[PDB]
Amino acid sequence: PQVRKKQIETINFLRLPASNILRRTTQRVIDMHLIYGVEWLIEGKLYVDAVHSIIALSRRFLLNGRVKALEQFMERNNIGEICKNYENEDQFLEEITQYEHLIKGIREYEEWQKSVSLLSSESNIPTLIEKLQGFSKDTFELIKTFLVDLTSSNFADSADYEILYEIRALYTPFLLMELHKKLVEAAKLLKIPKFISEALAFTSLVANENDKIYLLFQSSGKLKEYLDLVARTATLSN
C-alpha cells in the first residue's frame, strides 16, 4: 500500500473526480491486499459504514478458510473522537467477534497444558481448572450464534455464505470438543473432580437453539466423536 499509495497520488495529478484507481481504496491495497485495503476510518462522526466494508472483504476470499488472518482486521477501527475531534450492522455485529472466538477457544485448552508441572492425580492437586470449566462452557452455550447470516433485512451474499457454513463447521465443534477433553484429561467433571454429570448433563447442553449448535452438527461424524468421551467420563464412576 506504499507503492500503491504513490500510484494514487500520480492519478490525482492527472485529473478526474473519480478513477478506477479511486475505486479500489476501500478494497485494495489475495489475502494481504484486502486486509491492508481497509484502514481508512479513524476520525469521528461516521463508523456506521465501517463494519459493512469489513465483512464485504473478509468474506471475499475466505476460500483459504482463514480466520487467523482476521486477528487485526476486527480491531482496525478506532472510536477515537474523545477530545481529538474537538439496522445497518446487527447481523454482522456478532460475526466481527466470532471470527476471533475460534482461535481463543483453541487456546483455552492448550494454555492449561503448558501451565502445569505437577501430577494431575485427583485429590485437589490441580484446582486451577474450576473457573476454566465455566469459561469454556460459553463457546457452545455462548449466546450469540457463530458466524452465519442471521437476518435478511441487511445485505448478505450467497457466494460469501457457503464460506461461512464450512469455516464455522471446521472450528466451532473443536472448541466444544476441547471442553469435553478436559473432562477426561484435566479431570474436572463439574466444578469439582466429583460427580460425572457434565458429561451426561452436556448431552442436551450441546443441543441449544439460542446459539444454534445443533443444526450444523453431524449426526454420526461429530456426535460419535462426542459420545465416546462421555463414555470415558462414565467409567470415572464405574
Binding site: 508441572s117 505437577l118 501430577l119 485429590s123 485437589n124 492437586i125
Partner: protein, 670 residues
C-alpha cells in the same frame, strides 16, 4: 586524582603523625570506610573509589559498551579470502570504534550537564582526546593513508577540536569581528583568526571570520577589480573537496590559477590587508611557512599540512617536527603527548595511562585495538585473564567486569559475567572462579536468594557451575524456615542425600503429643494442601526441572496422606492414607519412613486392646512395618509413641509394651 577522605574530621593527611590509618575495601566501593585503630577517630568515613561509583548513567554507559562488543562477536584478534579480509575485518572494527566514542558522546552528553567532580568529566575529555588522534591516524582508514576516506579523516578532525576544547562557542567570531579599535578591519587578527580556524579544519567558525565582518565595506567601495579576485579567495575555500584527494590535485592547479588572478589585478587597498589575503592563500596552496606561524597549537599545524598541503600520511615524520617548529606539546597535563605516541605508533604503553583517565573507556579500547593488532602482548602461551599470558584486550576487559561485581552492585551481573564468557582465549576457567568464590560471607538464611544465579549461569552455561550455586544455598535454609521451595533447593544442590535427611524427618519423629504436627515448616499444618494446586509447585521446576519435579511425588502425596496428622479418623483420613504408598518413596525419599505416618492409632482405642474392635480401611490394607515388623524391615523410630503416648492419652494397651501387641491387633480383631 585527589579525593578528600573528609571535609569534616580528618584522620591524617600527613606523615608527621604515625597513626594507623586503616581502610576496608568490600563489596561496595562507593562506600569504603576509612578510620584509625587509635583512640582518636572512632568516626567512619563513607569514601568512594574514583571510577567505581554506583550511578545509573554508569549503568547506561557500561551496558552500551558491552552490546557493541557483542556486534564484534567474541572476536578480539586480527585475521589475515586474505587479500581483502585483512582489511574487511579491519573495516568493521573502524565503525565499532566510532560506536564506542559515540556512546561516549552520549555519556559526555550526560556528564557535561552535571558533574560532581569537574575532573571526573575531564577524564572523559582526555581519554577521548587520545582516542580522537587514534581515530584520525588509524581507525577509519584501515590503518592506512588519508586518501582511503577523506571526509571521515575530516570528521574526526572535528572531533579533535570539539571534544578537546569545549567549542563552538562564539569568541573567535567576536574577537575583532564585533569589537585594536576598528570595526572595519585592517588588523592581522582579522585574518589570523581566519587562518588558524581554517588550519583547524573547522568550517563553522571560519565562515564567521568572513561574514560578520569585512568583505564589503572597503574592498567593493575602493575598487571593483580588487573585488573580482578577493571573490576568488573564498570561492577556493568553498570548492575545496571534502570527500576525495583526486579532485584535490586538479583543485591544487586551480589554486595556482585564481590565487594568481589577484596577483594580476588592482590594488587600491592597504598593504596590510593585501598581505593578509596572501597569508590566507598560503594556507590554501599549503605552503610550509604559513602552516606554522598562524597555528594556535601543534595539532593545528600538523593538521594543516594534513589537509591543505598533501592529504596523505607522510607529513608526520619530517613535518611533525615542523609542527614543533610551531607549538609545544603539553606535558603538564597528559592528553597531547599520548597523542604523539599514536603518530609514532604504540598504543600499548598509553593504555596503562588511560586506566586513570577512566578504565571503562580504556577496557574497550584495549578490546578493539587488539582486533587490529596494533597492540602487542609481552607474554603468550592458568588460562586466566589477570595474567598477561592473556591479551592486552582481556587484561582490561574482563578484569573491568570483576570490579563491577565489587562496585556495589551485583545486578550489573547480566553485564559483567556476560563480558567474561567472551574472548578468543578460554575464560571459561574464570567463569568458574567469580561464581565459586563468595563463600565466607554469602550463603544467607532466606527463603530464596540464589534463584537468579541460574541466569548468571546462562551468561555462560556450564552445568557444573549451575549446581555449585545451590550447594552454597541448598542446605542453608533449615533455620530460615521457608517452605517447599527450600525442599526444592536441597534436591537441586545436586544431591539425593540431602532430601533423605531434611524432609525425611517431616515423616519420621513427627509428634510431641497425640497430634503428629512437628515441622518447623508451615506447609504441613495449615498449608498442607498449598502444594496440591500446582500454584506453588511451578517456580521451582522451571529453574532446573527434573531434579525438583520428581521429589514432588513425595511432598504432594502430602495433601492426601499427611491429613491423618491433623485429625485421625477411620475414614476420610483413612480414605486419604490407605491409598498409595508403594510408588512414592520406593524410588524417592526413604522407603519405610512409615512409623510416624501410618503407625499411631495402634495404641488408641479404635481397634483391639483388652476388647475386640476393628478400624475402617486399615484392617488388612496396612500390612508393611505397621503390623509385622519383627521380621519386616522398619526404619527405626518407634520409641516416640511408646512413652509419648502419655500426651496422647491412651491407657488400655499403653501399658506392658510389645511390638507384637501391634502384630496382634492387626491380625485378629473380629
Amino acid at each position: 586524582i585527589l579525593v578528600p577522605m573528609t571535609v569534616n574530621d580528618q584522620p591524617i593527611e600527613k606523615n608527621g603523625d604515625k597513626m594507623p590509618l586503616k581502610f576496608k575495601l568490600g563489596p561496595l566501593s562507593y562506600q569504603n570506610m576509612a578510620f584509625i585503630t587509635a583512640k582518636d577517630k572512632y568516626k567512619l568515613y563513607p569514601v568512594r573509589i574514583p571510577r567505581l561509583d554506583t550511578s545509573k548513567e554508569f549503568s547506561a554507559y557500561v551496558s552500551g559498551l558491552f552490546e557493541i562488543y557483542r556486534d564484534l562477536g567474541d572476536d578480539r584478534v586480527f585475521n589475515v579470502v586474505n587479500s581483502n579480509f585483512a582489511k574487511e575485518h579491519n573495516a568493521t572494527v573502524n565503525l565499532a570504534m566510532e560506536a564506542i566514542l559515540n556512546e561516549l558522546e552520549v555519556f559526555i552528553g550526560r556528564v557535561k550537564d552535571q558533574d560532581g567532580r569537574v575532573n571526573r568529566f575531564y577524564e572523559l575529555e582526555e581519554s577521548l582526546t587520545v582516542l580522537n588522534c587514534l581515530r584520525t591516524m588509524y581507525f577509519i582508514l584501515d590503518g592506512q593513508d588519508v586518501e582511503e576516506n577523506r571526509s571521515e579523516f575530516i570528521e574526526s578532525l572535528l572531533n579533535w577540536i570539539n571534544r578537546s576544547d569545549g567549542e563552538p562557542d562564539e569568541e573567535y567570531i567576536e574577537q575583532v569581528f564585533s569589537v585594536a579599535g576598528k570595526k572595519v578591519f585592517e588588523t592581522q587578527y582579522f585574518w589570523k583568526l581566519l587562518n588558524q580556524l581554517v588550519l583547524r579544519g573547522l568550517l563553522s567558525q571560519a565562515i564567521g571570520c568572513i561574514e560578520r565582518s569585512d568583505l564589503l565595506p572597503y574592498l567593493s567601495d575602493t575598487c571593483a577589480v580588487s573585488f573580482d579576485a578577493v571573490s576568488d579567495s573564498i570561492e577556493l575555500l568553498k570548492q575545496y573537496p571534502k570527500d576525495s584527494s583526486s579532485t584535490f590535485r586538479e583543485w591544487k592547479n586551480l589554486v595556482l590559477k585564481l590565487s594568481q588572478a589577484f596577483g594580476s589585478s588592482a590594488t587600491d587597498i592597504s598593504g596590510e590587508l593585501r598581505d593578509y589575503i596572501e597569508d590566507f592563500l598560503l594556507v590554501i596552496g599549503g605552503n610550509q611557512r604559513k602552516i606554522l606561524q598562524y597555528s594556535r597549537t601543534w595539532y593545528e599545524s600538523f593538521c594543516g599540512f594534513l589537509l591543505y598541503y598533501i592529504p596523505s600520511l607522510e607529513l608526520s615524520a619530517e613535518y611533525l617536527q615542523m609542527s614543533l617548529e610551531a607549538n609545544v606539546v603539553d606535558i603538564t597535563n597528559d592528553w597531547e603527548q599520548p597523542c604523539v605516541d599514536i603518530i609514532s605508533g604504540k598504543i600499548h604503553s598509553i593504555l596503562p595511562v588511560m586506566e586513570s583517565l577512566d578504565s571503562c573507556t580504556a577496557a574497550f579500547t584495549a578490546m578493539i585495538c587488539e582486533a587490529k593488532g596494533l597492540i602487542e602482548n609481552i607474554f603468550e602461551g592458568l588460562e586466566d585473564l589477570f595474567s598477561y599470558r592473556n591479551g592486552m584486550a582481556s587484561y582490561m576487559l574482563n578484569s573491568f567486569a570483576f570490579e563491577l561485581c565489587s562496585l556495589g552492585d551485583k545486578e550489573l551481573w547480566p553485564v559483567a559475567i556476560g563480558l567474561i564468557a567472551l574472548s578468543a582465549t578460554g575464560t571459561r576457567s574464570a567463569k568458574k572462579m567469580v561464581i565459586a568464590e563468595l563463600l565466607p560471607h554469602y550463603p544467607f538464611v532466606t527463603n530464596d536468594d540464589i534463584e537468579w544465579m541460574l541466569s548468571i549461569c546462562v551468561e555462560w552455561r556450564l552445568p557444573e557451575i549451575a549446581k555449585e550455586i545451590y550447594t552454597t544455598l541448598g542446605n542453608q535454609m533449615l533455620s530460615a524456615h521457608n517452605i517447599i521451595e527450600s525442599i526444592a533447593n536441597f534436591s537441586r544442590a545436586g544431591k539425593y542425600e540431602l532430601v533423605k535427611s531434611y524432609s525425611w524427618l517431616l515423616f519420621e519423629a513427627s509428634c510431641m503429643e497425640g497430634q503428629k504436627l512437628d515441622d518447623p515448616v508451615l506447609n504441613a499444618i495449615v498449608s498442607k494442601n498449598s502444594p496440591a494446586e500446582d500454584d506453588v509447585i511451578i517456580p521451582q521446576d522451571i529453574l532446573d526441572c527434573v531434579v525438583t519435579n520428581s521429589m514432588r511425588q513425595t511432598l504432594a502425596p502430602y495433601a492426601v496422606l499427611s491429613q491423618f496428622y491433623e485429625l485421625r479418623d477411620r475414614e476420610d483420613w483413612g480414605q486419604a492414607l490407605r491409598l498409595l504408598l508403594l510408588l512414592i518413596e520406593f524410588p524417592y525419599l526413604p522407603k519405610h519412613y512409615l512409623v510416624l505416618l501410618v503407625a499411631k492409632f495402634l495404641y488408641p482405642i479404635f481397634l483391639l486392646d483388652d476388647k475386640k474392635l476393628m478400624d475402617e480401611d486399615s484392617v488388612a490394607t496396612v500390612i508393611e512395618v505397621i503390623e509385622t515388623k519383627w521380621d519386616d524391615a522398619d526404619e527405626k523410630s518407634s520409641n516416640l509413641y511408646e512413652t509419648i503416648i502419655e500426651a496422647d492419652k491412651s491407657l488400655p494397651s499403653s501399658m506392658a509394651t510389645l511390638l507384637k501387641n501391634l502384630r496382634k491387633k492387626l491380625n485378629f480383631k473380629l
